[model samples]
Each structure stands twice: as structure tokens, then as C-alpha cells.
Target: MDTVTGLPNRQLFCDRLLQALAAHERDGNPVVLLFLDVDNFKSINDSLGHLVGDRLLRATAERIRTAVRDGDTVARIGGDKFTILLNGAKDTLNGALVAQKILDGLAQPFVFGAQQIVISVSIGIAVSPADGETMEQLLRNADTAMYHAKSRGKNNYQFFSP
Candidate 1:
């Protein structure tokens, strides 16, 4: 578990991802992976101190949870990085909808004592069969698309094209 947010760590995320892939193989429902990175997270920590940063992360986790389905896997992959497995997503549109929900959810400013911190995230989406058939490929492509989102703008989502 991540000590900061109490969310599942990377190892568990990998395990859950593999299971999701297996389910996809059997049921043929597309597996959607959404990779998220908190924009300018380092600056938040540097300026506000670790305590406030931790609070932000915890709040971020809660907001993400509210944005996604209850059964969807939401994990903290590492510093400012999170991965969500949309188990019930049927297509890229479903993934897109969730991404928008997450973006809107986090747009609300976080209040830490007297300070109001507004933050955003960049999301990369990878759908099974089109993006990748395996865990590694999906993760890599999703991360690549995440960087693409960052390139285009800080608070948006991008789908993996290839």
C-alpha cells in the first residue's frame, strides 16, 4: 500500500492488471488502462512542504475513487503517478468519459489550512486489442500517451494512436 494515500502500490496494480487482461481474453471486453500523473507535483511539494503534498495526494486519491467505478482498480504506481483499470469499459469512449470525470473532479481546489492549491493531471489511455494485448505493451503505450498529453497541455487526456 502507498503510505501517503493508502492506495494499492505498483506491485498489486500489476497483479490486478494481469487478472484484468486474463478476463479480457476470456470475455473479449476491451480492457482500458488510464495512466495519470499529477502535473507539477514536485513544485507542489517544494513550495508547500511534504505534509501538504501528502494531503493533496490523499485528496487526489479520494477524488479519483469517486470519479471511477467502485470495482475499477485505482493504484498509486509511484510518486504522483496513478493507474486505473477500467474493468467495465466497453470502448475508447468509455475511457474518455472516465478521464473527463477524473479531470473535472480534480479541478476543484484543495484547501490546506489557509492555502488553496489547484492542481491538474495528464491522462493517457490504452485500450486492449488496439493498444496492446499484453500488460507490458499497454503500460508502455499508456505512458507514452501520457507524455503526449503533457506535451499538448497539462490538464488533458490522450489516447494511444499506435
Candidate 2:
């Protein structure tokens, strides 16, 4: 656990995601990759001190870690950036339900000392085989979709198509 978020670092998450993809290579289990960015995080950093912003990041990670099913992978990739891998999701709906939970979780206010700070995430979802067959491809597609979600207006999610 790093001093900051305590979530798995980027390399660990990507390596684990690669292993998960390989696991599905034989049996072809269902998997979903989610790429997310904190909406308006720069504003948070500018208005609040870095310590407070870090606290918000920690809270975000905690909410996401608890929101997903047991054994799911969560990682903080960069400043205000995160990724999640959900294996054995029942279907696209299951992935969507989880995404909704994350969005709602972040929507709640975070109390830093006497300040109540609110945050939101724009999530991009990619379903295995449907979106991409490999980790790189899946991540790319999800990232594109995340930008789409942001364009539509931050704080929402969009699934990759074609």
C-alpha cells in the first residue's frame, strides 16, 4: 500500500488484469474493464489543499473498493485516475449496476474537517470479447468511452460500441 491511496499501483493492476485476461483465454469467462477519471478534480486541488484532495482520493478509493464484488481488482493508476476489473460479471447489466453504484458512491459528500466536498467520476466500460480480446485493446476502448462520457457531461458512464 502506498502512502497515498493504499490501492494497488498501476503496474500491479495492469499485470493482474493481464493475468485475468489470460485466465479467460481458455474458458472465455465474462469480464469487464472500467476506466475512470475524477471529474473536476483539478478544481478540487486548486480550491482545497493537497492534503484535503488526497483525503478525497482516499475516500473515493474506499467507496469503490467496497462497492464492487469480493475479489474484484481496483487500482489507482494516476492522479485522480483509477481502474477496476470485474470478473464473472453476469452480463452487461451487472457491469452497469456496479458503475451506477460507483457513481452514486462518489456523488455523496466527503467531509474533510469542516468542509463537505462532493465528487464525481466518469467511467468507461468494456466487456470482454464484446469490446476487446486483450488487456491493451480493452483498456484503449474503455479509455475512449470514458472520454465520451466526459464529453456528454462529466459524472456518467458509457460503454464501448464497435
Candidate 3:
């Protein structure tokens, strides 16, 4: 049963992210590390149930991937959390635009197994060279930015500066 959405686990997402960052290092193109977390996702999971949550998660990953170019990567970092690797032809503004698309994409009702769910995400973006050079630093900054975005409000994205 290809159920559970086969959501790309953290391990897989991390491996791909490392590859994306390394490629950026070689090509001199800045790679942006973006971390996204659902606002009150736990509330959804608790109120709805894990199965519905899984479906939404899968759908959300797909939405995020579609928002970016083929070169970019989307991964589920953990429960209600995801990480994106944005490389090429993008700055913080562009990255946030992509995230906003995802937010809107997820805004509509998601129907799965007789259930309709609505959710929102907060995105935190960190760019390479400007925020970090190594993959770890970039990832960390993105995570921090995500919390900051949450502080700003749900369904919004923010980029780390300095």
C-alpha cells in the first residue's frame, strides 16, 4: 500500500541537501538552505489523527517541490518540518516567493479519505556565502530563521541577514 506518502525521511533529505550544498561550492552559485515548519501542526495531528497528517504531509512536500525549479530539492526534515535546497537563479526574495507559493498551495482544503484539512507553514531561509559557507551552518541558520518566521506569523517566510 503505497500509503503513508512515503514522505522522504530526514536521512534522505539531509543526504540530498549535502549534495546540493557541495555542488553549490563547486559551481560558485549560492545555495539557500530553507527550513519550513507547519504552524500548529501538532494541533492538526492531534485533532485529526496521524493518517490524515501523513496525507497532508505528502501533499505539502509535493506542493513545495512544484514551487521551486527542478534543480531545487524538498525534503521532510522531521515531523511537521521540512527542508529545502535552493540553488541557482534565486536570492532571499526569490526563495521567499517560492515559499509563499507553497503556503498558498497548502492553504486550500486537502481531501483524503473523507477528511478535509487546512494548514499553514512558516519558512525560514538562509543563503550561502551570506549566511554560511558550510552546509551545517547554512542549515542551522535556516532553522533559526524558521523560528523567527513563526514569530512573525504563520504562512510567511523570512531570510536570515548577517
Candidate 4:
């Protein structure tokens, strides 16, 4: 499990993603790679303690898990970074549906202790082959897409263009 939220650790997330990308390497179908980060999470940690921060991350994980299907994976990729792999996406548009749900789910007020805090996320989606075939390339592309979402607004998602 991972820190802050007890979601799958980064190493495990990487392994899962690599396996999916490998399958895409063989099948040549689009596989969705999503990297989601909590908006202004540092500020939350700054205002509140790590315990509260942990609660926020756990809450965020549940929302993300609910947005995807049973076969899909929801893991904590890094510090405030969560990753999801959607196998056999007909197109990148399907990833958009999951992203939208995650965005909507984060809109609820999270009562961490006595404070009714609200948080948002920026999701980056990249498809294998469309983005890259290698693990590094795939991760980079997804990260770029997520940055695009963050640049536009705090809570939204985007797919890798290249």
C-alpha cells in the first residue's frame, strides 16, 4: 500500500501500468493511462497536519476508485499522484468519462475533522501507441496531459495530443 492513502504503492502502480502497456504493445489497441493529482494539496497539508492530509488522500482515492470499473486499477503513484489504467479503450473518449466522474466526485465537501474542506483534481490521460509504447514514454505523456488540465483549471482532464 501507499502513503497518505494506503492505495497501491508507486512501484506496484508502475508494474501494473507496464503490464498494460506491454499488452498494448502486442494488441496495438489504445490503453488509457491516467495521472490525477489533488489541487492545492500542499496548502492543505500546510494548514492542517499530515493526519488531515492523510484523510483527504484516502477520501480522494475512494472517489477515484468509484469512477472506474472492477478491472481498472486505482493506485497511488506518488506524492499526491494517483494513477489509473483503462484496458482496451476503444478511444481516448472513454477515459474522459472516467475523468468527468472523478471531477464530479471530488466536488463533495470532505469533512476532515471539523472543517468541511473541498478539493479538486487535474487528470492527465494518454493512450498507448498514441502517446508512446515504452513505459517511460507512456508515463511522461500522461503527466503532460495532466499538466495541460492543471494549466487550464484546477479540476479537469486532458488527453495527450501527440
TM-scores for every candidate against the unseen true structure: 0.94, 0.92, 0.84, 0.89
Best by TM-score: 1
Instruction: List model 4 lDDT by residue over 52-128, tens digit each.
Output: 88888888898888887666777875568888888665543747887887888888889965798988789998777
- Candidate 4's C-alpha runs over 4 A off are 25-29, 90-92
lDDT tens digits, residues 50-129, model 3? 87777778887788777777777677765778888887534536366677777788777878768677787788888776
Worst 10 residues of 4 by lDDT: 21-30
Winner of 2 and 4 under lDDT = 2
Candidate order, lDDT descending: 1, 2, 4, 3
How many steric overlaps are in each model, in order?
Answer: 0, 0, 0, 1
Which candidate, 3 or 4, would have the higher TM-score against the true structure? 4
Q: Relative to the true structure, how large is the alpha-carbon lDDT of every model? A: 0.87, 0.83, 0.75, 0.80
lDDT of 1 by residue, 97-126 (tens): 999999999998999889999996899998
When summed lDDT is taken over every stretch of 10 residues in candidate 3, the lowest stretch is: 1-10
TM-score of structure candidate 2: 0.92
Q: List ranges where model 1 is wrong by over 4 Å.
A: 25-28
- Check candidate 2 and list the clashing pairs: none
The C-alpha stretches of model 2 lying farther than 4 A from their native spots are 25-29, 91-94
Candidate 1: residue 120 lDDT (0-100): 68
